Every structure is written in C-alpha cells, then in structure tokens.
C-alpha cells in the first residue's frame, strides 16, 4: 500500500545505510577458504587481521584458543548490537526490543534454577549471555525465593505480558523448565508475528514468511525428538506456534505422529518441506536436516535484503552474522583437532 | 594396557569431535549441563575375583538406571545429545574396565 | 551402585562426561567433580583431591593429564587399591603418552 516508502526514510536513513554498509562488510566463501588455508590459530588471526575482523586479541595471551575467539565475536556483535539500538527510534525499537526478548527467554531459564538449588545471583551474572541487561532491581538480590523473582518478572522485566501464561510457581517447580521455555518462546513468536502484521508494509512482507518457517521448523523438530522421550502427545502439541501454514493443517498429523516416516508423509504434503527433508538424508557422514533449516534460513535472510523499506535488515544482519560466527567457530573446532577432513560442515553466508 | 590407552585416547577424540559438532549446532547447553544435576544414572559396583591365593579387586559397569536429562533448548539437536550421550557411555565403559 | 565416579577437568570434558552417565551431588549438596579454568591454582585441586580421597563413594577418580602434573605429588604419594586415579588429555591439550604413574610403578615395560 502507499504507507510504506514515504515515512520510512525520513527517520530510518541512517540506521539503513549503517546496516547495509554492515552487510556488505560480510566474508564472503573466498575469505572462508583463505581462513581454511591456515593449519594453525595463529594464521587464524592473521587472516582474520585482513579483515575487518581481527586486531582484537592485540594487548591479550600469546597462546590462542577457542574460547578466545568465541568471546571476540560475541564482543564485537554486543558492542555494534547496542551501539546501533541507542540510535533509534520507537518503531525500530520495539523491533530490536523483540530481537532482545528471544534471548532474554534464554537467561530467565538460566536465572531460575540457581533459586530451587540456592545459588547465588552474583555468580549466575557473568554466565548470562550478553545483551541480558537485567539492570532492572529487586530481580538482583532476591534472598532465594521463587515467590521474589516471580515478582520481579512480573514487575521490573518487560516478559510479565508473555509471563501472564506461566504463572503461580506451579510450573516454575514441577514441570520441566526445558517446556517452560518452549511455551514462552511460542508466545513470543505470537506476539512477535501480531505485532508485525500490525506493521502491514514491506515489514510484514519481510517477516511474515520467515517466522512462517521458523515455526514450523520447531513444530517438525519437536515431533522428531519426541519419540524417543516421555512426552504426552498433547503436551507436544501445545508447543507449536499457531503462526505458520502447519495450523490451518499438519500440525495434527504431526501431533498424532509415531515415527521419522509419518514426519515425513507430514512435511511430504508441503514442497518446501519435502525438498528440505529430501535432501536431508540422514546418511552418515552428511549434512543433517537442520544444516538444510539454517541454509533455508540464511537464504531468506539474504532475500530480504532485496527491498529497502523493512525493518527486516537488522534482525537479518544479525541472524547472519551470529550464522558466520558460528562458522569461524566451527572452522576453528576443525583446525584444533587436525579432522581437516571435515572443513566442509559449514553453511555458507553467500 | 597402553594398547587399551591408545583406544582410550582414540574413543576420547571422537567424543570430542562430536561434542565439537553438537556446540556448533547448539551452543550453549553445557551450562544447563552443570548447573542442573540431580542423580546419577550410572554406578560402579565393588567385586572381588580371587584368582590365586590372595584376592583381587575389580569393579563393574552397574547400570543404574536414572532417566536423563531432555536439553529441548539450545536449538534442539537432539541427534547430536543422543551421539555424545552414546559416545561418552562408550568411554566410560572403557575407562571402568582399564581402571 | 556403590561407588559414585568423580571427574577433575576443563569444562568441555565435566559437560561431556555428565552426559555421559555420572556426576552425583550428595545428600550434603556437594558435587563429586570440579571444572578447572585457567585462573584455578594448586591449592584447591589438591583439597578436593584429598576429599575425595576420604570420601569413601568415589571408587574410581578420572582426572586431566596436565591436572595430574599440577599436583603430581599427590599422586604419587598416595598408593592405594581403591582410588582407581586414571589419565586423560583434554581436546586442546595433545595425546598423553607417557609419565603416568601406573607405567612407572611397572618399570620394566617399554
């Protein structure tokens, strides 16, 4: 419609210029092959040094390992995260706010369980992932108490709308604290998609179709593993997010499933399922099936990089750049063990 | 027993190298690992074999049996989980009978 | 059943180890492990070795090689059946190959 390509620019010029200026500082597979032609970690960081990339274990140990590498990237993907967050503006910022909340899901399940076993809350501090903020009070000290931190999600920390369904301490104690995050995580997805319908332009186009994947990716994983653990079917399918093509129709099947072939027939139904879970063979000493989700997913991202008027430019930034983190990860594990003869396990970023 | 070293070693490696793999496809489950730990699933029985006139000590993989642990968090791989969890038996197998 | 197996190494061989079937906290909510980082010194290495050493559920003790080294001596003055102490390398760390305290109490091997 004509709402979009007019007000966009007018408070977004800059930040969609840094972003594509971002995306297209990428390493392309050239860059991934020079950083395989190196045999040691020290040639690892020179070839990192050609890029953008490297000069930031300068002034740290002379020895090189994993851990190092790993805590440079994520650095250096908090400090540009949050450097470009606080220039913003509100539109953006609920958007960059729901990018935060996917992973605050993640230290709310880290936070508790150092409560039910008393730990303290000082040392579970540094282990939360980065962009956890929580500089929210009365979260931080609260005695060891379950009623506490229940209290200070409900109040001080921003999911008390999604904590509206997990509620009372009964599911923080009995019931697994893994479903706890699943069931948040497909409220968030809900949300997430209402809000972004709500934003019906070049946005929507964007994210509807890859949240679309997203959940039903899970719902397909969810059946997958399910099998070989106790889990009551309903209980299965009470994790499926309603936003995807599996609600209308599927998810029923997948619910009644029994066996990886009914998975199978289920995702048979859907082309762009039954490519994935073809060239997913299952043969070992080959890629997987979610390798095949990650290469779906980093195809989308670079998709959406086709139009100028969405939102979707940073969450696909980062979706992208955490992908090829992983990737020098996963180039580094593969020098460090000298199996040079598994290099080739990683999705390109195009 | 170096002979039983080296196949420590080798079955050690590739625990490893698929615990390398399963953190490339998850990440960061082994704090939820190590902070959540409620019963052991595996245990040692004490046993004795008196093969001369004095009697020796040995010991023997007593599965115990505790159910373990579900990790649906950390994008779900739960193909590699299951491998580690499979591999690491395998190696503690091994480490029993050498000890 | 009887023996509860304890594990001293970096953090990818606890969280590897604990999938793999072991790890115990007591009734008194004491782990039967610990992870070394590099900041950790020898002092605490050896009081938990010793801890576990009059902890009669251990049975079997699996611990680094170059773990092994910062408190070698521990090793070899204690001689005992029951504290089965084995050695292990960890991913970063190479093979280990030799100065193991079992082949050396053997000398007449290789």
């Known amino acids: 419609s004509f709402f979009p390509e007019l007000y966009f620019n007018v408070d977004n010029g800059y930040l969609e210029g840094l972003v594509r200026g971002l995306k297209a500082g990428v390493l392309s597979q050239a860059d991934y092959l020079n950083l395989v032609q190196c045999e040691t970690l020290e ?129 923080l104690d009995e019931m697994n604290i893994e479903i706890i995050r699943n069931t948040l995580y497909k409220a968030y ?31 397909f994983i969810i059946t997958i593993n399910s099998f070989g653990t106790e889990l009551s079917k309903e209980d299965r399918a009470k994790l499926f997010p309603h936003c995807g093509r599996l609600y209308p129709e599927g998810l029923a099947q997948l619910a009644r499933a029994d066996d990886y072939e009914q998975v199978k027939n289920v995702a048979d139904y859907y082309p762009e399922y039954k490519l994935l879970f073809e060239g997913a063979g299952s043969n070992p000493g080959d890629k997987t099936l979610e390798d095949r989700f990650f290469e779906h997913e980093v195809k989308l991202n670079k998709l959406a990089f086709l139009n100028q008027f969405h939102f979707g430019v940073f969450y696909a930034f980062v979706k992208l750049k955490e992908q090829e983190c992983r990737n020098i990860v996963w180039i580094a594990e593969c020098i460090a063990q000298r199996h040079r003869a598994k290099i080739d396990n990683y999705i390109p970023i195009f | 027993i ?67 642990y579900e990790l649906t968090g950390l994008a779900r791989g739960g193909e590699q989980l299951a491998k580690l969890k499979r591999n690491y038996a395998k190696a503690v197998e091994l480490l029993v009978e050498l000890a | 059943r009887g023996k509860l197996i304890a594990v001293i190494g970096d953090e990818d061989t606890v969280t590897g180890f ?93």
């Not at chain 1, 899901?105 to 880290?110: A, E, G, M, Y």
């Not at chain 3, 072991?22 to 590099?38: A, S, T, Y």
Request: negative net charge; charged residues 25%; aromatic residues 8%.
């Open chain 1, 43 to 171: 040639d690892l960081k020179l070839h990192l040094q050609s890029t953008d990339y490297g000069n930031f274990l300068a002034n740290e140990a002379s020895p090189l390992t994993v851990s190092v590498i790993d805590d440079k990237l994520k650095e250096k993907m908090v400090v540009e995260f949050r450097h470009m967050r606080n220039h913003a503006y509100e539109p953006l910022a609920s958007f960059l706010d729901f990018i935060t909340y996917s992973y605050m899901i993640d230290n709310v399940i880290l936070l508790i369980t150092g409560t039910l076993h008393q730990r303290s809350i000082a040392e579970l501090v540094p282990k939360c992932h980065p962009l956890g903020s929580f500089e929210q009070m009365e979260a931080v000290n609260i005695a060891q108490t379950p009623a506490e931190l229940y209290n200070a999600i409900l109040v001080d920390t921003p999911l008390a709308a999604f904590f509206q369904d997990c509620i009372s301490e009964q599911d």
């Open chain 1, 189 to 219: 997805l809900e949300s997430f998609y209402k809000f972004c319908t709500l934003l019906g332009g070049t946005t929507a186009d964007a994210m509807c179709p890859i949240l679309e994947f997203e959940a039903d990716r899970r719902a």
């Open chain 2, 2 to 68: 170096i002979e039983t070293k080296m196949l420590m070693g080798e079955v050690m490696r590739e625990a490893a190298f698929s615990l390398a793999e399963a953190k490339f496809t998850a990440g960061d489950f082994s704090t939820t690992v190590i902070q959540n730990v409620n019963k052991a699933q595996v245990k040692i029985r004490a046993k004795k074999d008196n093969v001369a006139g004095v009697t020796l000590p040995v010991f023997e993989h007593y599965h115990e049996g505790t159910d373990s």
């Open chain 3, 18 to 110: 604990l999938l793999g079937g072991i790890g115990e906290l007591n009734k008194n909510r004491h782990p039967n492990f610990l992870v070394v980082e590099k900041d950790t010194t020898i002092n605490e290495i050896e009081d938990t070795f010793r801890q576990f050493l009059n902890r009669d559920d251990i049975g079997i003790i699996l611990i680094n090689q170059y773990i092994a080294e910062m408190v070698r001596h521990a090793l070899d003055a204690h001689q005992r059946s029951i504290p089965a102490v084995l050695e292990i390398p960890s991913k970063e760390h190479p093979y280990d190959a030799a100065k193991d305290s079992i082949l050396r109490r053997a000398k007449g091997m290789f």
